[PDB]
């Protein structure tokens, strides 16, 4: 069923609808307490606070090689920082993360794509609701196109990540209905 890949395609997007259901369940639980349980939002006028607080500085220090992770063995929450959660995200506006997107693009590095952001990438879609502003539609188009550059660099199409990457692109085209990125055949004459 190389041609009919719709079956697998549904599973990817299908998960997105499911994710929203989970949020509703925790809505009642969070309502039982205010934003103070474990969420500190730096003043709005301090844009620097949002970028650092939300993405933390641990990314800069990196943690995966081994000793880098244990670069602060004292407690736990401190050497872990504040990770993204429903409570943190629930208070964040759709527009707030949108502006923060500009800073992310600045890193550029072409060949760079830091798979670390991917974990974060999913949160952005969950934070987007209602119709996307004209500007919002344009930006999502920008990041998807850049990814294509990585494929050219890859020596072998049968790589190992390519399959996941292929599925990832399909998600954007159907969910947002952006037929512009959709891989249409040939109109079938």
């Amino acid at each position: 069923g190389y041609s009919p890949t719709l079956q697998w395609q549904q599973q990817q997007v299908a998960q997105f609808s499911t994710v929203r259901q989970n949020v509703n369940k925790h809505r009642s639980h969070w309502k039982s307490q205010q934003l103070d349980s474990n969420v500190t939002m730096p003043k709005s006028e301090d844009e620097e606070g949002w970028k650092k607080f939300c993405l933390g500085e641990k990314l800069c220090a990196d943690g995966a090689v081994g000793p880098a992770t244990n670069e602060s063995p004292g407690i736990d929450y401190v050497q872990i920082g504040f990770p993204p959660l429903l409570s943190i995200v629930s208070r964040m506006n759709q527009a707030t993360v949108t502006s923060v997107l500009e800073y992310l693009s600045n890193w550029f590095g072409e060949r760079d794509f830091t798979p670390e952001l991917g974990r974060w990438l999913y949160a952005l879609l969950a934070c987007l609701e209602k119709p996307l502003l004209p500007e919002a539609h344009s930006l999502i188009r920008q990041l998807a196109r850049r990814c294509s550059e990585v494929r050219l660099l890859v020596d072998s199409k049968d790589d190992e990540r390519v399959p996941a990457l292929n599925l990832l692109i399909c998600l954007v085209s159907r969910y947002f209905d952006q037929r512009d990125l959709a891989d249409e055949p040939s109109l079938e004459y």
């Binding site: 990817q12 998960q15 994710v19 989970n22 307490q33 991917g118 399959p163 996941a164 599925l167």
Partner: peptide, 26 residues
């Protein structure tokens, strides 16, 4: 009681979704 409920249901559900999508290759 003290009442400290909040982790009753894996709130990390969002995190789990990350591995499944990427894992989609095995």
């Amino acid at each position: 009681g003290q009442s400290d409920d909040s982790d009753i249901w894996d709130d990390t559900a969002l995190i789990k979704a990350y591995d499944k999508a990427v894992a989609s290759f095995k």
